[PDB]
Structure formats: structure tokens, C-alpha cells
Amino acid sequence: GQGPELHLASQFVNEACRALVFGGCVEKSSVSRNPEVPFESSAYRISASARGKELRLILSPLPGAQPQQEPLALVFRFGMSGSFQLVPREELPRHAHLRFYTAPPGPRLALCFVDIRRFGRWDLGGKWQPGRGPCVLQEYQQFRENVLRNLADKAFDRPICEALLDQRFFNGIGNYLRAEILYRLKIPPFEKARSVLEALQPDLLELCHSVPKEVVQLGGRGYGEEDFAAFRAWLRCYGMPGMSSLQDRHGRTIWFQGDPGPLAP
DNA sequence: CGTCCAGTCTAC
DNA sequence: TAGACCTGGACGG
């Protein structure tokens, strides 16, 4: 997922878990190479926040819960195929790698981290990844300043389409968002990043916020196949007929219209 | 059947 | 930088 999907997943966890109470341990599938979550409580609540391409779960025991346990935080990266589902406890999806089980009273549910390809990761810390820049959705002013104050960095020597995937400066931007952002300003994707940005100190850094915010305001992204059609209708550039495509230097497809730009392969 | 396609992470 | 990490759906023979 990209920023909008991480944000919608966190909203899903908060709304779906608002009136739920979890109990017992945190179950990992046997094939996941991610760490076991050392947590048990008779009664805990689950809440979430997103920052960029990361999601933080907080496991919060209720007053009196046993064993003695302090709130525990988990940070998830989704990779290519990560998501959260709330499912009936005996109808786990195929790739449910981490599960939180509702306590009784009511229907036994499992909140699941589901990840087909297992490119997703989680850490016990609760800390955001060091080196990831601020969230383009929730920390816009910090994100904007962190870019404009470090244009000398060699990251900005690269084509703008490659720079937009660098999570130290554009935390939350992925493949579809870089195409949609550049399409709206008709910036050639192989323009030098430093050239497009030096001329800024509604612009490119503004769209790094407002474009992904549009995806959030659609809602959906899992969180029927109606909001999947809603998304495909919103896309103007990524994968669309009449658009060009090239491989960047890491073999990721950039969709665009017209001029490929000077640093084109 | 087969090939090809859809975000980090790390060994060179 | 190139390869690794993985599964499944769309498509071709």
C-alpha cells in the first residue's frame, strides 16, 4: 500500500475495533519470518495511526486486565500485498500472518494482518523507521521543509520520478501516486528532481499532499468492488490507455503523457 | 502448461 | 546496481 491505503487501513482498525475487546495472545502464522509478539491480556482494545507507508497498532489492556501488561505498540510496513481484515475466527483468509482475537461476549472475530507475498514486515519497538521523512498526508509542512532544506542531497540528482519513491523525502508516495502527481503538472518524469524543486523555494510538493488526500476522500481501497471501480475512474495516468510507460533505473514502471524528459533511459 | 506482471532490503 | 524476497491473476500456446 501507499500513504492513502495505510491511512484508510488505520481508519478501518479504529472504526471496526471501536466497540470490540480483544483477549489472549497475538498469533503469528508459522511461515512468517517476522517476530512473535510477546503480549497477553484478558481484555485489551486495539487502535491505529498511519504515518506515510507505516501503520502503528497500539494494544491497550482495560483496567484490571490480567496478566499485568503495559500497552504495546507494533509498526507495520505492508509491502506489495498487505492489509487488515476483520473476519470470523474460524474463517481466516489464506495469508493471515498475524491475528488478534476478540474476547467474549458476542461473535468471535479475528483482526488479521493479511499479506499474500510477505513483502510486509512488523517490528516490536513501536518506533517509526529511522530515515523515513514526514508523512505527506499528516505532516505536510514538515514534509515540505524536509525536502526544500536538503535539495543538495544526491537523492535529488536523480530523475524526479525516482526521487518521488525515496521514502526519506516522500514518505507515503508509491508507483501510482508518482504518475498521478507528475501528470497533473505535466512534469516530464525524467526531468532532474533538483531542477523541478529548486524552483519552489499549486506546486509539486503541494500535490504530494493533495493528490493522495483525494484517494483518502474517495474512501474504499478495501475499507466492495464498487470503491475499486471508484479508484480506477479517479486514475488519470497510471496504467491508462493513450499513456506512455518507461522503466526507471530500479525496473519500476513510470506512466506519463508526452515528453519523457532529459534523463530518460 | 509457461511467461510476465503487480516496495523495500541486502549482498556485491 | 542487480537480485532476492513471494503469490496469484491475466494471458499465450
Side-chain angles (χ1 to χ4, degrees):
Chain A
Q2 292 172 55
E5 292 72 31
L6 276 284
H7 186 100
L8 286 163
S10 89
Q11 284 180 229
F12 167 73
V13 172
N14 291 326
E15 284 170 278
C17 297
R18 188 165 303 165
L20 302 178
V21 174
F22 296 79
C25 289
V26 175
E27 207 178 55
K28 189 179 76 57
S29 75
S30 57
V31 65
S32 187
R33 263 118 63 83
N34 291 300
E36 294 273 4
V37 178
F39 184 93
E40 206 200 5
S41 179
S42 65
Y44 68 101
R45 302 206 290 193
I46 303 188
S47 63
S49 49
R51 173 179 186 264
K53 254 168 225 202
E54 297 196 289
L55 179 152
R56 171 144 76 212
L57 282 195
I58 301 180
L59 317 186
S60 304
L62 300 194
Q66 307 285 334
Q68 214 26 228
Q69 178 78 74
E70 281 289 302
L72 176 155
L74 295 180
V75 176
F76 289 80
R77 292 176 292 291
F78 278 21
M80 282 290 155
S81 66
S83 61
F84 276 96
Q85 297 178 35
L86 187 59
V87 300
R89 180 189 191 110
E90 301 327 320
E91 300 151 47
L92 292 192
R94 215 158 111 77
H95 305 287
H97 294 315
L98 198 72
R99 313 110 177 210
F100 313 81
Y101 289 115
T102 56
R108 313 321 295 280
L109 305 181
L111 178 70
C112 297
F113 178 62
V114 184
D115 186 6
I116 296 153
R117 294 174 75 197
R118 287 187 244 119
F119 287 4
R121 302 276 140 108
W122 64 84
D123 300 292
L124 295 188
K127 302 297 221 121
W128 304 122
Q129 201 166 242
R132 297 173 92 94
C135 177
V136 293
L137 281 166
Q138 295 201 261
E139 304 180 290
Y140 168 63
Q141 213 58 233
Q142 293 126 104
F143 147 71
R144 188 183 181 90
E145 277 159 18
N146 183 60
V147 174
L148 290 182
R149 137 176 73 80
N150 289 295
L151 285 192
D153 190 297
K154 28 281 140 230
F156 297 112
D157 301 325
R158 302 288 137 57
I160 182 61
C161 70
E162 294 173 23
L164 283 179
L165 294 186
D166 188 325
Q167 294 302 293
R168 294 181 288 136
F169 295 107
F170 297 96
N171 180 18
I173 301 315
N175 205 20
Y176 87 73
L177 284 173
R178 67 170 181 169
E180 291 303 305
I181 286 157
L182 290 177
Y183 177 76
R184 301 238 184 149
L185 284 179
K186 311 290 184 271
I187 299 170
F190 290 100
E191 197 54 87
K192 185 179 203 179
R194 183 165 308 99
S195 313
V196 158
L197 293 172
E198 254 176 349
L200 264 67
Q201 12 182 33
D203 65 43
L204 176 63
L205 293 179
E206 217 157 357
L207 291 172
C208 288
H209 170 73
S210 62
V211 171
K213 192 173 182 66
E214 287 181 9
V215 178
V216 171
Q217 308 277 248
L218 291 192
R221 296 302 276 144
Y223 294 124
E225 294 98 88
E226 306 134 302
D227 63 39
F228 184 56
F231 182 70
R232 302 270 298 160
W234 174 84
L235 282 181
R236 303 171 194 198
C237 181
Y238 176 87
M240 291 290 278
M243 297 295 161
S244 296
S245 79
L246 290 167
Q247 312 291 101
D248 60 30
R249 81 187 199 144
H250 316 296
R252 310 214 61 196
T253 302
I254 178 59
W255 295 86
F256 61 103
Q257 198 185 66
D259 177 24
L263 301 172

